[PDB]
Amino acid sequence: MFFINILTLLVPILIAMAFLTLVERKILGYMQLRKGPNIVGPYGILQPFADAMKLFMKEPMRPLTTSMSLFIIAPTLSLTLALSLWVPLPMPHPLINLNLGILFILATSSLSVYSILWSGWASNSKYSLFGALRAVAQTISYEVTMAIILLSVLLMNGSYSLQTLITTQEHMWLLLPAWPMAMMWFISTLAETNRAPFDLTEGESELVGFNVEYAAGPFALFFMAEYTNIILMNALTTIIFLGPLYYINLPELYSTNFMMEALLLSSTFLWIRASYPRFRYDQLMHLLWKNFLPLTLALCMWHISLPIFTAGVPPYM
Amino acid sequence: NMTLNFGPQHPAAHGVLRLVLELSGEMVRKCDPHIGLLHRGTEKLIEYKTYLQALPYFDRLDYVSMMCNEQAYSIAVEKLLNIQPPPRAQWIRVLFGEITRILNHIMAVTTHALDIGAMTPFFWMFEEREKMFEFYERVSGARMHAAYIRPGGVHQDLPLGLLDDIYEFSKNFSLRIDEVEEMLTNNRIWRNRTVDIGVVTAEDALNYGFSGVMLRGSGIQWDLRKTQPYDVYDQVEFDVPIGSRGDCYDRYLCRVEEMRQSLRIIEQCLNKMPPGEIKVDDAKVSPPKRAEMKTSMESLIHHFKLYTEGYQVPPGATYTAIEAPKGEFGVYLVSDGSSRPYRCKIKAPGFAHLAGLDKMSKGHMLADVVAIIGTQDIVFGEIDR
Amino acid sequence: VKQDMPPPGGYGPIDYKRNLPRRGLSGYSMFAVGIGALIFGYW
Amino acid sequence: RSRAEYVVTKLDDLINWARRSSLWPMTFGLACCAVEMMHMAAPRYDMDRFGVVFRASPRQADVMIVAGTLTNKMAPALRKVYDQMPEPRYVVSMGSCANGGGYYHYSYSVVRGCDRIVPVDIYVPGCPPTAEALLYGILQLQRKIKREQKLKIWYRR
Amino acid sequence: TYKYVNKKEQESEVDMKSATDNAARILMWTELIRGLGMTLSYLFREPATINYPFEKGPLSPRFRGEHALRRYPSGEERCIACKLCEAICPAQAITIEAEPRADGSRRTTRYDIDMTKCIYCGFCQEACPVDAIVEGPNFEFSTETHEELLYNKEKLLNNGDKWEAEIAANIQADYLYR
Amino acid sequence: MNLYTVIFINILLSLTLILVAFWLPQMNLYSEKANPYECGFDPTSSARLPFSMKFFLVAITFLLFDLEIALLLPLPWAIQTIKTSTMMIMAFILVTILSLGLAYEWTQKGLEW
Amino acid sequence: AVIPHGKGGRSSVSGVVATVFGATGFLGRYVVNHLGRMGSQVIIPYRCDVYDIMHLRLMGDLGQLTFLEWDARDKDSIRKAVQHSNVVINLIGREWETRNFDFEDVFVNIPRAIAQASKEAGVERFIHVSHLNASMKSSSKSLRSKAVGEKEVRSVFPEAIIIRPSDIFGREDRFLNHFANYRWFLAVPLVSLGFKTVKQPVYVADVSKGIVNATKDPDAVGKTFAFTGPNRYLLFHLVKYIFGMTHRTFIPYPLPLFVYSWIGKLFGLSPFEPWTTKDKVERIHISDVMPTDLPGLEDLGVQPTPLELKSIEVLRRHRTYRWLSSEIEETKPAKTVNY
Amino acid sequence: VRPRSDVTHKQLSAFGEYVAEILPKYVQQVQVSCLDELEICIHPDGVIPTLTFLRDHTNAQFKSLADLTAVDVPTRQNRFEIVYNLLSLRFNSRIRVKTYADELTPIDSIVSVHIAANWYEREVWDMFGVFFFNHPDLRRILTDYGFEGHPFRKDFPLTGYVELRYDDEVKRVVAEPVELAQEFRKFDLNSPWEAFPA
Ligand SMILES: NC(=O)C1=CN([C@@H]2O[C@H](COP(=O)(O)OP(=O)(O)OC[C@H]3O[C@@H](n4cnc5c(N)ncnc54)[C@H](OP(=O)(O)O)[C@@H]3O)[C@@H](O)[C@H]2O)C=CC1
Ligand code: SF4
Ligand code: SF4
């Protein structure tokens, strides 16, 4: 039964991963006055499966100058961490409820920065290092504010367990309070998934990036990872800040609304991508260290003070 | 320092540029652009081809502003023949010349964004661009590479429905500029990527021979369309969009204004196009009409000789410059009395601009260079020739 | 005789100037919205 | 149906469908023909609909649409990018400049065709080969990819 | 007549109200939200793409497309080998050699348009006195092998016979203009 | 264990994918197909040579700010501490002193890439 | 015939219309290269899908290379291929007896039918290629079967040249790559510790040029040339040398062949292309025969090219980034054995 | 017949005299075409001096270099005819200063006077072979890296002497002497009858 549950979480998520790609190629399309992929299958539903098969069949290329492990470990790590981080998400009931759940999500995300570092060293191709060193920096920087923003949240939740927020948000979303950080969580979620406004990790016009020397299957796994993440981080926004209504008698309306909010915020980063030009490498770090980190550290203190003098210290457990 | 080709196949270069960089980390210290990847021998081939059979070559030098290019050869050859195009033809060349500057600017503004990372502006305008090519195809038969503007006059009369269709496109086009206007002109992300990047001082721009929006962007007031009015640019009213400071933003804003000013010129041309003939009536210079060559001997002889041998323009040499969308496009045509030219130096607004990349991209990151090439509107056909 | 020409009286007028609309909520009013959310949210 | 032959015919039909449905062309445009495809990528004739999505990294690309003249200075490169593309790979030569020398055939700086440099699968004709015309050529590549029977040949080899 | 773009006419001194409006613009990304609205708007517009095989992008009569050699209604091929179509071809594409046919008429023994050499200028359409060589409407003639693109008299005459009905209609529509 | 079960399936799923990816596809590999890759011309350098990072002082700081965060992480349990006054007095001092570290990072060329 | 006009390069004519049935091969690729360079008309019968023969298209000029669909079991396909050729070159061969084709077929059965038809057609000359040192009694079924063929084809086609090449040295060859690829294997087995099986490699091009020269020379009729090489080698130096250029450790450990023939049997089972072959193994330890015979290279006009000279290009792909820049001069040469 | 204003043919003519007078050490001929274009002709040594006077003279400011080109008249002893076309945004007029240079008698470089010429001078060396002293970095711009011969010279074959193809044997692109499959048909076009006295 546990395996059944393991399958129920991973298989559906992976399929959702696939169709996000399709949805990204139609919502971007209609925004740009074009139908998008509808000719393969009905309305393009078979389109994600089609290139998956093309990608795996095409010859994986191992560059003459390439490590053969820091090359194959990197995608495996990227897919493994991203699919793994869905293990504790408390859609209604979580699967593996962890008392220090949010620290698990923060730690697992942090490990993905290596895959970028390992793939870049493995490729030993310019246009790759230039992509990994800047990339690791972006990801790491957007971790420092990412973590502080969560610590502010937790202090108003009382615990690190993601399951507690379902009881914290039984009367109001944590967006109303703490909206200023939501925005800053959303922008940081955009950086950590290397999506558009912050896609310098792999800029195409700039260093076509970390994936240039990777093809076929090796390419797909990260690929899958990114998109699953795209969902996971959006889902964490939909639990931590937008709290779906929870009724203990019927758990699925929690998951039904979790479904609706996650899809809309997942739709939002798709919409952000088409709408904005990409930021400069230093313009990106200028935002986090200058614009956001002082806001976050100060609002972090406000969230240690709001509890005490408003006699609202949250109940542990 | 490090060296990256940042070269061919990049999605930043047009596909045909080798920009050997000397990146110190991310900052770029020196650029040594290696053009020549699309040198086709355009000017050594023209010497072996008659004046009409060399027109086509001029539609392929800057391949995004075809007709304005072929208005520079047409004006040159016409000068050397002391012949002038008929009144309707001159309006048609000005009508097609501004459709080409809207077409080049949609090319330059949207592809610049494609390089920076904004995807959607390209798709919205490119649909508006095929609407425009249709106008080329409906008047010449080729979507691009028309060959419509002939050394004397233009080749065929406008079909009977084109001016109504150009009104409907021009009527609704400005909202389309307004729409990318909102999506890419105040985005802090665009401004940051474009503002204060590649500033070029006024005297430096004149000294480097920039001569284009690059000249106007830094505040120098020079438009060959008002200063030295070629064709009818003396009977149409427009405002040159001079920018103030020179950052890649002021240059973008100028390019968006010229699209708007060109709609003002296109409006006047549709409102005031004269009834008349589209090609000069000298059979010696412009071919005879299809019915005439099939019923009058003097016309068949003139058709046979013009197509087989040529105009035989009188010996001389001229440098004729017109304001092509990129900048001053000039042809120095040296002519012996023969029907085929002796030399045809195509001055390309672009050979001068690409030279400026090293000076303009000074103290700038790898990413800034992508914007610097984008704001020169460089098409390597014109530079490589 | 019949050649493609502007309609009699000329064509109508075409707009070229930017028509970007300055439509938005005033800044003070805007601040209040977010501030109010926080103020209430905290309570 | 039941026959090791039928299973091997159906499965390539599957393998061929995947390659046919998702052809990722390479972001490599020379001269002007690249514009006449930027029009194919554009809204009147979307290419994505058919599956194709421009991807710069040769390493992640299935079709190389050579657009424009291949000068004798870009030849040594085209071959490199063709050589660095993943194995399943196809070439579409667009433009009379590329399939044959076109205007500029007799130039000293132009290779008279990309067929001299890279093996070419479909030749799309026209000075600016129209954008539908490229789309017909890409669709003709898809007809060529459907006909290929790699698994059948391995079985009866 | 000139026009300043990006030139600030004057120094508006900050007024709290102004400052707030601005600060709000930076803090709550107001202009960024403006941009998102534009793209959401189009998402709701009808896409402009055409089913390519089922629907075709419109081409009017002058479209040059693919070369064809026409024949008189009687059945006598129009070309009389004057060979000025060869003279005016910019790319040297057309190669013509002729000899008096047995009938005694002038005709071309070999007429070879190298389409890869041809840049589809349409001057040949222009130059022909009998208008035997025409730019036919078809643009879809992509070929697997380079040799197929080279065209001899028999392919062009066959191309002419296949598309004669539309070629005649197209020339019918545009001849007054020429 | 329950976590161990999930994780090994997670690695298995990824290792399964990569394996298929390398053995199913057919492969033919002349050099120049595997050679390094820099836009179509020879690299013209080692592609691993010393690469300068203009972000010299930003990098060092991140590490210091990370640690502060660390110290800021125990807060959730420390909120319930009976003292409260000392808690906040401590936490506010930590956040303020690090932020000043940042302040000096800004003031100095650090964080100015 | 076709009078030879031109300057000598592509777009010129040499007048050799030649069916070449196994062109897709490693040797083949080279044969079509020169034939195409010279300007000869080359008909390439092929069975593999068009995708795989694309590599042959750019070779040769337009209308100079013609590809025909052909099946070995179907006699009619061979019939039409040689219809209009005047030179037929046979390079049909394999190392792994495939499910539907036996060594006899690939070497003796098929290459007969082919020359047989060629005669019916009236082709001026047929060149048949069989492995060097091929006794009708040689251990490897392959070599013996090949020997069987060179006899037969002489009765189907008299005065048919029979070049008999040694194992070939070239990029994409086995002789050199096989050993270099033993890297995957931690230890590199070598029967008799790689001794007493002196081997003389021959560059592929030399072989190709030789073959081509045959097509255009009256001196070769019924000749059984033997392209051999510029220097012989005990398998030991060869193996190490290879590993030397590859810059990978060399660990020669002797392996009793009786057991090793078994290892060949193992890989030999591969459904897909077999890595090694029982018939291979024997061949590898089958000593190169001495050079007393109608000479090949030089005799046919090409001076052999030493192995060390081009080895760097063949073995480069097997090196690691660390050694990629390393050059031949840095490395040492192997030693020959006039024995 | 084109409309011609003699105002210009008079203005430009006068200026020509003015330049000539001011720079008599180098100006050999100064003509105005029937197309109202001035074309001071200077001894090659006057390259630096004549340009500088035009770039920096209050009564003749010629700030930008429109183009630098070299026609090649093989008959002429001095084969090349370097032509510099300049523009004066202040006086809205263009002038052309043309000098003569033989193959191995180099001209001075004006990169100092106008930096626009940095590239065009490299273009003239690559195509015609004229050499420019004191040039910062003269090196082929348009031709291939290993190209031998200067292409726009009238004595260079159009098709050239080398063409490129990929050779499998050597797995690398390889030059070969040009072999063309349809030579450029050299139509003779000049008519045996003249047009006017000119
Ligand atoms: N080291 C060497 O290479 C040596 C080779 N030789 C001889 O030279 C010849 C060429 O060798 P090489 O090129 O390496 O051989 P390959 O393994 O490269 O194959 C040669 C060609 O034969 C074709 N072929 C093989 N089996 C069949 C079949 N059953 N039906 C139809 N065609 C077939 C193959 O076509 P496809 O792949 O399409 O099936 C291939 O193109 C061989 O015959 C061999 O006996 C002699 C001495 C040394
Ligand atoms: S083919 Fe016609 S269009 Fe395509 S590049 Fe050559 S010239 Fe430009
Ligand atoms: S011009 Fe018309 S008629 Fe005269 S040859 Fe060419 S095609 Fe035949």
The Cβ of residue C22 has, within 10 Å, a number of other Cβ atoms equal to: 4
Nearest to B313 by CA among B101, B26, B78, B29: B78
The answer to whether residues G250 and G243 touch, using CB atoms and an 8 Å cutoff, is yes
Question: Which tokens in the block code for residue A137?
Answer: 């920096």
CA distances from A288 to A148, A292, B182, G151 (A): 12, 5, 26, 82
With beta carbons under 8 A apart, name residues in chain C contacting A178.
38, 41
The answer to whether residues G43 and G86 touch, using CB atoms and an 8 Å cutoff, is no
Tokens 């510029």 locate to G230
Residue A77 identity: L
The answer to whether residues A33 and D43 touch, using CB atoms and an 8 Å cutoff, is yes
Question: What is the residue-wise DSSP string for B255-302?
Answer: HHHHHHHHHHHHHHHHHT--SS-SS-S-TTTSPPPHHHHTT-HHHHHH
**Distance between CA atoms of E43 and F65, rounded to whole angstroms?**
42
Q: Is B31 known as a binding-site position? A: no
| CB of G250 closer than 6 angstroms to any ligand 1 atom | no
Run of H or E including H66: strand H64-72
Q: How many domains does chain D have?
A: 1
Task: Tell me if residue E139 falls in helix, strand or coil.
Answer: coil
Nearest to C30 by CA among A218, G172, A230, E30: E30
Run of H or E including A144: helix A129-155
Cα G17–Cα G23–Cα G24 angle in degrees, nearest 5: 150
- Dihedral of the alpha carbons of B163, B168, B170, B172, in degrees to the nearest 10: 180
Question: Based on the number of CB atoms within 10 Å of its own CB, is H178 exposed (0-12), middle (13-18) or buried (19 or more)?
Answer: middle
**Distance between first and last Cα of chain D:** 22
Give residues preceding each break in chain A, C–N over 2.5 A.
Answer: 208
Run of H or E including B192: helix B188-194
**Distance between CA atoms of H13 and H19, rounded to whole angstroms?**
10
Q: Per DSSP, which regions of G176-295 are E strands?
A: 188-189, 202-203, 252-253
Question: What is the residue-wise DSSP string for H97-120?
Answer: EE--B-TTS-EE--TTT-TTHHHH
Touching, B vs G (3+ Cβ pairs under 8 A) = no
Q: Is E106 known as a binding-site position? A: no
**Distance between CA atoms of B368 and B371, rounded to whole angstroms?**
5
Chain B closest-CA separation from residue A256 CA (Å): 32
Under 8 Å CB-to-CB from B365, ≥6 apart: which residues?
A280, A281, A282, B26, B27, B28
Residue B67 identity: M
SS3 content of chain C, % helix, strand, coil (to 5): 35, 0, 65
**Distance between CA atoms of D66 and D132, rounded to whole angstroms?**
16
Interval between CA G94 and ligand 1 midpoint (Å): 5
**Distance between CA atoms of B271 and B268, rounded to whole angstroms?**
5
Q: Whose C-alpha lies nearest to ligand 1, atom 21?
A: G22
**Distance between CA atoms of E116 and F113, rounded to whole angstroms?**
53
User: Residue D68: left if φ>0, alpha if ψ -120 to 50, beta else—which one?
Assistant: left
Question: Which tokens in the block code for residue D4?
Answer: 């090791």
* Sheet with D122-124: strands ordered across: D63-67, D90-94, D122-124
CA distances from G230 to B249, F94, G178, G303 (A): 69, 79, 21, 8
**Distance between CA atoms of G24 and G4, rounded to whole angstroms?**
27
Question: Which tokens in the block code for residue G138?
Answer: 């040689």
**Distance between CA atoms of B70 and G14, rounded to whole angstroms?**
46
- Side-chain half-sphere of B207: how many Cα atoms within 13 Å? 15
Q: Looking at the DSSP assignment, which residues form a beta bridge with residue G19?
A: G43, G88
Q: What are phi and psi of B216, to 5 degrees?
A: -65, -35
Q: What are phi and psi of F3, to 5 degrees?
A: -65, -40
CA distances from G339 to G133, G134, G286 (A): 16, 19, 14
Question: Based on the number of CB atoms within 10 Å of its own CB, is A79 exposed (0-12), middle (13-18) or buried (19 or more)?
Answer: buried
With beta carbons under 8 A apart, name residues in chain H contacting B208.
115-116
Tokens 């995300």 locate to A109
Chain E closest-CA separation from residue C4 CA (Å): 11
Range of the domain at D98: 3-157
Touching, D vs E (3+ Cβ pairs under 8 A) = yes
Nearest to G131 by CA among G177, G175, G185: G175
Residue B63 identity: Y
Nearest to B213 by CA among B169, B249, B183: B249
**Distance between CA atoms of D48 and G2, rounded to whole angstroms?**
51
Q: Per DSSP, which regions of E82-169 are E strands?
A: 94-100, 106-114, 133-136, 150-151
Task: Tell me if residue B78 falls in helix, strand or coil.
Answer: helix
Q: Could you say which of E32, E40, E49 has the minimum Cβ distance to residue A34?
A: E49
Q: Whose C-alpha lies nearest to ligand 3, atom 4?
A: E82
The answer to whether residues B54 and B341 touch, using CB atoms and an 8 Å cutoff, is yes
Q: Looking at the DSSP assignment, which residues form a beta bridge with residue F43?
A: none
The answer to whether residues B14 and B379 touch, using CB atoms and an 8 Å cutoff, is yes
Interval between CA H133 and ligand 1 midpoint (Å): 62
Chain D closest-CA separation from residue B220 CA (Å): 32
Chain H closest-CA separation from residue B18 CA (Å): 12
Burial G42-81 (b: 16+ CB within 10 A, else e): bbbbbbebebebbbbbbbbbbebbbbbebebeeeebbbbb
Q: Is D53 on the interface with B (CB under 8 A)?
A: no
The Cβ of residue H99 has, within 10 Å, a number of other Cβ atoms equal to: 25
Is the alpha carbon torsion for B61, B66, B72, B74 positive or negative? positive
Across the interface, do G317 and A66 touch by the CB < 8 Å criterion?
A: no
What is the domain-level CATH number for residue D80? 3.40.50.12280
Question: Which tokens in the block code for residue B137?
Answer: 């195809």
What is the domain-level CATH number for residue F65? 1.20.58.1610
Ligand with the closest atom to the CA of B303: 3
Top mutation candidate among E83, E107, E113 for ligand 3, by most atoms within 8 Å of CB:
E83
The Cβ of residue D130 has, within 10 Å, a number of other Cβ atoms equal to: 28
- Ligand 3 contacts (CB < 6 A) are E 79-85, 96, 127-128, 130, 132-133
User: How was it solved?
Assistant: cryo-EM
Residue G104 identity: E
Q: Is E101 known as a binding-site position? A: no
Q: What are phi and psi of E100, to 5 degrees?
A: -70, 120
Ligand with the closest atom to the CA of G108: 1
Structural domains of chain B in order of their starting residue, each with its CATH number:
1-385 (1.10.645.10)
Q: Which of residues 2-41 of C touch E (CB under 8 A)?
A: 24, 26-28, 30-31, 34
The Cβ of residue H171 has, within 10 Å, a number of other Cβ atoms equal to: 16
D31 CA: nearest ligand 2 atom: 5
**Distance between CA atoms of G329 and G309, rounded to whole angstroms?**
10
Touching, E vs C (3+ Cβ pairs under 8 A) = yes
Nearest to G295 by CA among G172, G194, G165: G165
**Resolution (in Å) of the shown entry?**
3.5
Q: What is the DSSP letter of D129?
A: -
The Cβ of residue B215 has, within 10 Å, a number of other Cβ atoms equal to: 26
**The 3-state secondary structure of F3-70, one letter per residue:** HHHHHHHHHHHHHHHHHHHHHCCCCCCCCCCCCCCCCCCCCCCCCCCCCCCCCHHHHHHHHHHHHHHH
Under 8 Å CB-to-CB from A43, ≥6 apart: which residues?
none
Question: What is the residue-wise DSSP string for H115-131?
Answer: TTHHHHHHHHHHHH---
**Distance between CA atoms of B219 and B245, rounded to whole angstroms?**
7
Computed on alpha carbons and rounded to an integer, the radius of gyration of chain B in Å comes to 21
Burial A132-158 (b: 16+ CB within 10 A, else e): bbbbbbbbbbbbbbbbbbbbbbbbbbb
Please state the residue numbers annotated as binding site of D.
32-33, 97, 127
| CB of G284 closer than 6 angstroms to any ligand 1 atom | no
**Distance between CA atoms of G38 and G10, rounded to whole angstroms?**
7
Q: How many domains does chain F have?
A: 1
Question: Which tokens in the block code for residue G297?
Answer: 């290279």
Across the interface, do G58 and D119 touch by the CB < 8 Å criterion?
A: yes
The answer to whether residues B8 and B368 touch, using CB atoms and an 8 Å cutoff, is no
Nearest to E114 by CA among E80, E87, E86, E150: E150
**Distance between CA atoms of D79 and H5, rounded to whole angstroms?**
57
- What does chain H come to in residues? 198
Q: What are phi and psi of F12, to 5 degrees?
A: -60, -45
Interval between CA B145 and ligand 2 midpoint (Å): 9
Q: Is G319 on the interface with F (CB under 8 A)?
A: no
Q: Is A16 on the interface with D (CB under 8 A)?
A: no
Q: Is B279 on the interface with C (CB under 8 A)?
A: no
- Counting one residue from chain A and one from chain E, the pairs whose CB atoms sit within 8 A come to 36
With beta carbons under 8 A apart, name residues in chain A contacting D24.
51, 54
Residue G83 identity: Q
Residue G82 identity: V
The answer to whether residues G120 and G88 touch, using CB atoms and an 8 Å cutoff, is no
The Cβ of residue B29 has, within 10 Å, a number of other Cβ atoms equal to: 16
Nearest to A153 by CA among A190, A188, A189, A180: A180
E85 CA: nearest ligand 3 atom: 6
β-strands H41-42, H27-29 pairing: antiparallel
Chain H closest-CA separation from residue B207 CA (Å): 6
The Cβ of residue H71 has, within 10 Å, a number of other Cβ atoms equal to: 20
**Distance between CA atoms of B144 and B99, rounded to whole angstroms?**
12
Range of the domain at F63: 2-113
Q: What are phi and psi of B55, to 5 degrees?
A: -55, -50
**Distance between first and last Cα of chain H:** 17
Across the interface, do D150 and G54 touch by the CB < 8 Å criterion?
A: no
Cα G19–Cα G21–Cα G23 angle in degrees, nearest 5: 100
Q: Whose C-alpha lies nearest to ligand 1, atom 8?
A: G91
Question: In chain D, whose CA is at the least distance from the CA of H157?
Answer: D108
**Distance between CA atoms of B186 and A283, rounded to whole angstroms?**
16
The answer to whether residues B217 and B202 touch, using CB atoms and an 8 Å cutoff, is no
Cα B110–Cα B111–Cα B116 angle in degrees, nearest 5: 95
Ligand with the closest atom to the CA of G71: 1
Q: Is B123 on the interface with A (CB under 8 A)?
A: yes
The answer to whether residues A280 and F70 touch, using CB atoms and an 8 Å cutoff, is no
The Cβ of residue A118 has, within 10 Å, a number of other Cβ atoms equal to: 22
- Ligand 2 contacts (CB < 6 A) are B 60, 145; D 31-33, 68-69, 95-97, 102-103, 127-128; E 119
**Distance between CA atoms of F86 and G325, rounded to whole angstroms?**
64
- What does chain C come to in residues? 43
Question: In chain F, whose CA is at the least distance from the CA of G313?
Answer: F31
The answer to whether residues B267 and C14 touch, using CB atoms and an 8 Å cutoff, is yes
Across the interface, do H169 and G11 touch by the CB < 8 Å criterion?
A: no
Chain B closest-CA separation from residue H22 CA (Å): 23
Q: What is the DSSP letter of E68?
A: E
- What does chain A come to in residues? 317
CA distances from G275 to B269, G201, G268, G269 (A): 75, 20, 7, 9
With beta carbons under 8 A apart, name residues in chain A contacting G319.
64
Q: Is B113 on the interface with A (CB under 8 A)?
A: yes
- Side-chain half-sphere of H198: how many Cα atoms within 13 Å? 12
Is the alpha carbon torsion for F92, F93, F94, F95 positive or negative? positive
Nearest to D95 by CA among H197, B144, F107, E37: B144
Nearest to A154 by CA among A310, A311, A307: A307
